């Protein structure tokens, strides 16, 4: 039914609010809309950084502190992502094991697809808004640190074409969760029963929403081909790294 | 429209029967042992390798399926020219197209002559098992693999040729190939192509909630299989220095 596509659509949203502080529509108005109310610092350069970094506090070479924040930042989107899935409907009846394997497997791919939310070619939103780093800037970093945002940038250009909002986003990134092609799955079929549910609501979703966007759905679920190319590149620029940035307790938390 | 989209759907049902002389439907027929076809010789050794090669033994293995990729490119080469629009477009997008999207559509459609116990060969005459791919000299005995775990989930969709033909077409038409000239003309033509895909399954499989979304999910699967693929190419390139790719191959491998 339609009726019950649409009532799992509007839970999604309601749940997707309450789990990301900051959405799409929110992200959108600070990078370029008609909000005019505060402004984001601007970082461009090392001393813009420097200054950054005293007026906006962050809760050693440049290129590792920017490479430790992302990870900061990374730990903290899954835990909002791991909360949402919670609230998906069938998730929390499945095998624990499974729940941890979708989520263990999911979560980089559902970072770069927000990640595109607060981003524009030009850069990225940081600390909940507080603040915009350049591509530019994070271009020039170094010999291994200098590459890994380029690809995520990439993405997002292309992403954002498709100019989908946060009520699209909240059901195409718990189809992302309920993938049945995870390795070590218990029990495959009420993932897939589930997705098989979610790809119906994302698909009824997309024609409302965008009545005049022909294929969207097709173009949206292709997207998950690049999604997961940039994951294996990622952790492959992740491998090189460790042999460059070679406490305990610290990588403790960041394994 | 309905009726445009399945008119879309014949013609490209028709080119590729043109185009691709063993089929799904001829494949299974060869594989379950339905009396329309003949059993294959069955190869699981070297010396019904041996016994086979009527009509190195990894080298050899390693060629035949050299012959068999180029053999295969030019019959997508040929489909190709008959899908509606593409020769129309750039030539340099033509040529970029087919140069990343064959292999797609060769692991794609060799699965059509793939179980789990092994694969086709020579035109169905024969019957290679994965297990005597497997045993082959270490850098030779691991190509397959992978293409047989693709082949036994991608085959539990149970796609027949008429899916495939509308299928193969959408990867031709990728707009997101490295170095396209002009990407909206071939996003044009891959959104009539989808559209195409979409209405078949539907009518196709009404039982198969969902299909068109599994089966786009698994061009992931394929872009991996290519990935895994040239790695372990330049391997045997640096083992082999006597041995020789295609012409053909070398120039789309880049
Ligand atoms: C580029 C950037 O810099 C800051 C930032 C920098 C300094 C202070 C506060 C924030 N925030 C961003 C936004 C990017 C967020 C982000 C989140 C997660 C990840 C993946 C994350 C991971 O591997 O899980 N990672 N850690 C290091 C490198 N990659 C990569 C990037
Ligand atoms: C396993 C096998 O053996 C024979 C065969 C063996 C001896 C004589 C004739 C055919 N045909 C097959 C099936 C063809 C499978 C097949 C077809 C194409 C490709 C891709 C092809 C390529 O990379 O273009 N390739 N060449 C060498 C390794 N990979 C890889 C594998």
Do not use: W
Request: hydrophobic content about 40%; glycine content about 4%; some cysteine.
């Amino acid at each position: 039914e339609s009726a019950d596509l649409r009532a799992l659509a509007k839970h999604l949203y309601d749940s997707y609010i309450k789990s990301f502080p900051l959405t799409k529509a929110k992200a959108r108005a600070i990078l370029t809309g008609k909000t005019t109310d505060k402004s984001p610092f601007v970082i461009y350069d090392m001393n813009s950084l420097m200054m950054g970094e005293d007026k906006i506090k962050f809760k050693k070479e440049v290129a590792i502190r920017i490479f430790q924040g992302c990870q900061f930042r990374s730990v903290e989107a899954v835990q909002e992502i791991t909360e949402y899935a919670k609230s998906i409907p069938g998730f929390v009846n499945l095998d624990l094991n499974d729940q941890v394997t979708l989520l263990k497997y999911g979560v980089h791919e559902i970072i770069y697809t927000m990640l595109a939310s607060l981003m524009n070619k030009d850069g990225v939103l940081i600390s909940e808004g507080q603040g915009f780093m350049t591509r530019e800037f994070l271009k020039s970093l170094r010999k291994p640190f200098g590459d890994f945002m380029e690809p995520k940038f990439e993405f997002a250009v292309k992403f954002n074409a498709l100019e989908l909002d946060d009520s699209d986003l909240a059901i195409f990134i718990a189809v992302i969760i309920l993938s049945g092609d995870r390795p070590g799955l218990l029990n495959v079929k009420p993932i897939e029963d589930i997705q098989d549910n979610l790809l119906q609501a994302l698909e009824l979703q997309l024609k409302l929403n965008h009545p005049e966007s022909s294929q969207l759905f097709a173009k949206l679920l292709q997207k998950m081909t690049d999604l997961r190319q940039i994951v294996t590149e990622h952790v492959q620029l992740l491998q090189v790294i460790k042999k460059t940035e070679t406490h305990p307790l610290l990588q403790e938390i960041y394994k």
